[PDB]
Design a binder for this molecule. Structure first.
Ligand SMILES: [Ca+2]
Length: 240
């Protein structure tokens, strides 16, 4: 997250760190959202590589013992069947991870609430991106979980020629684009939390930013629109 602030450690209890095994260590690669005690929602592109993955819930500082973490293996990966890694602009950037164990819920570990199917946010709706991704274009991962305020940019604006044009689909949410705040590498897969009727819900799965840079004016961060995938999510969990 570029232009973020450090989150409070109990603000975003559905955020997870998706990590892969790297020698005798683990490396953070992506975010995700805990949606059942044994299921995480992330981006498909986060799991294109043939890596060994784990999920960390209750994580605040990637580099320090928080005293709240639970570490759990990924048992099964179900990528959306229309996903193509060489066509991120086509959409379908979503995957579900079945965890090897059910995590225990507490003030640091909670299920993310998803919107009702079909819900579309008004332009300029209040949202936060969260993650441990780079804090500058071509920078380094955050140590502590970051948040940034990224108001939505509706489809008509986002898909206009000075924004993303044809690259953005109605199956996506755009947010931000102010040139200061954005998602960045290592945020992919994580949530966009939007305040609706007094409740935050996870409306987005972080999918991409511009090849030119993370915080680029009129290139808002692009997310998979969770409300387009409710039936798919429910069907995968019910069949697995
Ligand atoms: Ca930690």
């Amino acid at each position: 997250v570029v232009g973020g602030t450090e989150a409070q450690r109990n603000s975003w209890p559905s955020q997870i760190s998706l990590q892969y095994r790297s020698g005798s260590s683990w490396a953070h690669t992506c975010g995700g959202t805990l949606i059942r005690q044994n299921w995480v929602m992330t981006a498909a592109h986060c799991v294109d590589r043939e890596l060994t993955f784990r999920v960390v819930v209750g994580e605040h500082n990637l580099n320090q013992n928080d005293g709240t973490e639970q570490y759990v293996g990924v048992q099964k990966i179900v990528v959306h069947p229309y996903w193509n890694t060489d066509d991120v602009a086509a959409g379908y950037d979503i995957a579900l991870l079945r965890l090897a164990q059910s995590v225990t819920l507490n003030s640091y570990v909670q299920l993310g609430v998803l919107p009702r199917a079909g819900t579309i946010l008004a332009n300029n709706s209040p949202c936060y991106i969260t993650g441990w991704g780079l804090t500058r274009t071509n920078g380094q991962l955050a140590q502590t979980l970051q948040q940034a305020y990224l108001p939505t940019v509706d489809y008509a604006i986002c898909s206009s020629s000075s924004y993303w044009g044809s690259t953005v689909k109605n199956s996506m949410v755009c947010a931000g684009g102010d040139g200061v705040r954005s998602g960045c590498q290592g945020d992919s897969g994580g949530p966009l939390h939007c305040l609706v009727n007094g409740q935050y819900a996870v409306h987005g799965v972080t999918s991409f930013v511009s090849r030119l840079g993370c915080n680029v004016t009129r290139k808002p961060t692009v997310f998979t629109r969770v409300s387009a995938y409710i039936s798919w999510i429910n069907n995968v969990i019910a069949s697995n």
